[PDB]
Amino acid sequence: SRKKMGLLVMACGTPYKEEDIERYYTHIRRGRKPEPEMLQDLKDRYEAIGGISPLAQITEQQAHNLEQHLNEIQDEITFKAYIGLKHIEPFIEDAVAEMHKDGITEAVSIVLAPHFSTFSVQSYNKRAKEEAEKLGGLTITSVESWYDEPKFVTYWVDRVKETYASMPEDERENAMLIVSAHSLPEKIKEFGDPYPDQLHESAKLIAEGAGVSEYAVGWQSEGNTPDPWLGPDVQDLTRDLFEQKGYQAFVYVPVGFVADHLEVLYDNDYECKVVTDDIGASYYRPEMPNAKPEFIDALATVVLKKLGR
Ligand SMILES: *Cc1c(C)c(=O)n2c(=O)c(C)c(C)n12
Ligand SMILES: [Cl-]
Ligand SMILES: [Cl-]
Ligand SMILES: [Mg+2]
Ligand SMILES: [Mg+2]
Ligand SMILES: [Mg+2]
Ligand SMILES: [Mn+2]
Ligand SMILES: [Mn+2]
Ligand SMILES: [Mn+2]
């Protein structure tokens, strides 16, 4: 007498091989194919971070581990996971169509991004519900945010504590914690979008639980459009704080991201590292959640809380 439920896990997506770069970035750029020089630059960046194929495996592993863990920790519901991506197949609509074809009538969705925004999360949930409505006979209840789930806060708190415990004593007393997420166009403010407030609260909760008194909030990985995006960018923030107070170590927590992808392995571990190397400071960036059991249990709790169980 276990009830059957779909578990729709949504994410941005990643190329599966080098020859996917063109079509992935064309989709991100709203139909504008990157010029040859940019295509070559992107290939070089992926080669520099160790290759493309490991990156797509992570979302698959997160969805699989989440399904199995959810089915182990309670006895009322049997979940089946379906992956729906924004920028490459399987797309969100493909996942909903597959759920419908398989006989799913009830689903719960979650986006692998802990902060709500009108640009990403709300768009993903709207797409999923609209496909379900067009097909009929299937309903979806959607997680909207989960940055404040205690288990997730604790993941990052314990990683930050481990990092501060490892540094030399002079660094430990003169370090700066930078907490960041993916930048979005500033115009989201016109809708009252809580995304910036939620990033600031994540930073408060992590710094507080870790006992870190000196921290700052920044943004990273902005796209390219004429209208402004949320700032300051982590590169400028790092340099400005160093000019202000001479910090000897910077610790980066990209809380908006859940996996080892280009926006962390390159935009932090390279682009921020260039700045810290130039100023003479040490660089630290603790492990991303990926598919680790502590993170999977946090996500399972988010899902069961959403269902009132
Ligand atoms: C992959 C991706 C894009 C294109 C984007 O705008 N964002 C976000 O805001 C997040 C959190 C992720 C992932 N992505
Ligand atoms: Cl929610
Ligand atoms: Cl929310
Ligand atoms: Mg090849
Ligand atoms: Mg909430
Ligand atoms: Mg960039
Ligand atoms: Mn397993
Ligand atoms: Mn601020
Ligand atoms: Mn981006």
UniProtKB/Swiss-Prot annotation:
Q: What species does this protein belong to? A: Bacillus subtilis (strain 168)
Q: Which family does it belong to?
A: Belongs to the ferrochelatase family.
Q: Quote the protein name from its UniProt record.
A: Coproporphyrin III ferrochelatase
Look up the domain of life of the source: Bacteria
Question: Null mutant: what phenotype?
Answer: Deletion mutant requires hemin for growth.
Keyword Metal-binding included in the entry's annotation: yes
List ligand-binding residues for Mg(2+): E19, R45, D267, E271
Q: Specify whether Cytoplasm is a keyword of the entry.
A: yes
Q: Where does N-methylmesoporphyrin bind?
A: C12, R30, G31, R32, H182, K187
Please write the reaction equations for the catalytic activity of this protein. Answer: Fe-coproporphyrin III + 2 H(+) = coproporphyrin III + Fe(2+)
